[PDB]
Amino acid sequence: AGRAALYKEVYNVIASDGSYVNYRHMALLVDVMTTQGGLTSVTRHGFNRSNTGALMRCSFEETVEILFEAGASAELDDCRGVSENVILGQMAPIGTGAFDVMIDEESLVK
Amino acid sequence: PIDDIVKNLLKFVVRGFYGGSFVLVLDAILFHSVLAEDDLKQLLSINKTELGPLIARLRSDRLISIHKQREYPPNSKSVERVYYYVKYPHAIDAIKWKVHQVVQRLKDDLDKNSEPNGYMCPICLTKYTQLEAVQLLNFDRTEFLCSLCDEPLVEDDSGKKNKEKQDKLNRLMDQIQPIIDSLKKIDDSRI
């Protein structure tokens, strides 16, 4: 019921503005706010207080605190996040780079 | 008794490895079990800046422990008096460990001069070992060059310096034999 009610609340402001937005986007947004149980705020206290990699959380707002807690607690980063691959300066798993291209030597003789 | 042999040990070590004022303070504590700071100042007639480094040196060697005793007598003045006390076991342990470190540090210097290995470079003032020497050997040259200077090196170390490290061991043993004998005499009763 909290989920459906949240969807109604968001949809209301959209329809009030006199605009149309597809069901997909609003559904995705609502679901993200409810996948950890309860209601989760969209804040710097609402996704930087849960693990996603030290870089991904530190990039948004409070950099030094997140980094210090990371080094203190010996945290490990998986480094498949978007911002992480951006910072390191190499290909990320998004779109074209979400798959590797290979070669088949058995196909060259065709 | 065993307690007096510790006193003679502290006299031999403090007298043997430090100046005179150190055994002045040391004996000043051996005469009075609780020696105030004002008594040592009016005794040796030394300044505060002269009594400081002496007590700090006797405390850095774990020879004596201090006891800052409170005072609230006559004029209601919180007169604090640093009473010095001889710390026998920590001082004996300090003497034994220091002797062991002297023997070990004087034994390592003998193995270095027993066989020359490394080299030296006068031009860039950089030291090179035998490894870098054989790694900087060329075919068109007959001597070990230097990456910084590409010029020949000079053999470092020699057998003449090996005669100095042995005399330090013999003289150190002849000057440490009574001390280590007193240590072996005190360590029998573990006091």
Binding site: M102, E105 | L131, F139
Partner: protein
């Protein structure tokens, strides 16, 4: 020591070498780079056994440049020195710090201080030779050297030997 070990190497090929015969090229490269060279982890690579049954696995395309990367697993005969290893060799170059013994593809050096007292250096001879109380160490002479230490740098390996101990010296 002359050991045999299965080694793996990543071969890079230019996009111009993608013909049907490319496998041969691989082996070609697999020879030209591996045989004769040296590695600080496996020693001097001598030969490469098993040339017909060379595994090719699967080639992968790295992003930019478009070059192809391959992971090859093969069997090879390599030579790796070890510390405190009695070997034999022949002198090549002579120096006042000691003569340079040649053991296979490795040029070991023997320090003068690591030599007995009776062995003295002689520069008046041509070539300069080390003359002792019974043996004369010359270039073409064979000397049994006991290697004391070895250095394993990348693509470069040098060792240090000695002949002071018994059962050593000239052969």
């Amino acid at each position: 020591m002359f050991f045999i070990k299965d080694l793996s190497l990543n071969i890079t090929l230019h996009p111009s070498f993608f013909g049907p015969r490319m496998k041969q090229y691989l082996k070609t490269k697999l020879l030209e780079e591996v045989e004769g060279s040296c590695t600080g982890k496996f020693g001097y690579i001598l030969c490469v056994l098993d040339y017909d049954n060379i595994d090719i696995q699967r080639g992968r395309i790295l992003p930019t440049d478009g070059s192809a990367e391959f992971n090859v697993k093969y069997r090879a005969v390599v030579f790796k020195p070890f510390k405190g290893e009695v070997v034999d060799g022949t002198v090549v170059s002579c120096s006042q710090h000691g003569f340079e013994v040649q053991v296979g593809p490795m040029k070991v050096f023997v320090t003068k201080h690591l030599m007995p007292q009776d062995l003295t250096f002689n520069a008046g001879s041509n070539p300069p030779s080390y003359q002792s109380s019974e043996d004369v160490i010359t270039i073409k002479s064979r000397i049994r050297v006991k290697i004391e230490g070895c250095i394993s740098q990348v693509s470069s390996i040098h060792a240090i030997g000695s002949i002071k101990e018994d059962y050593l010296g000239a052969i």
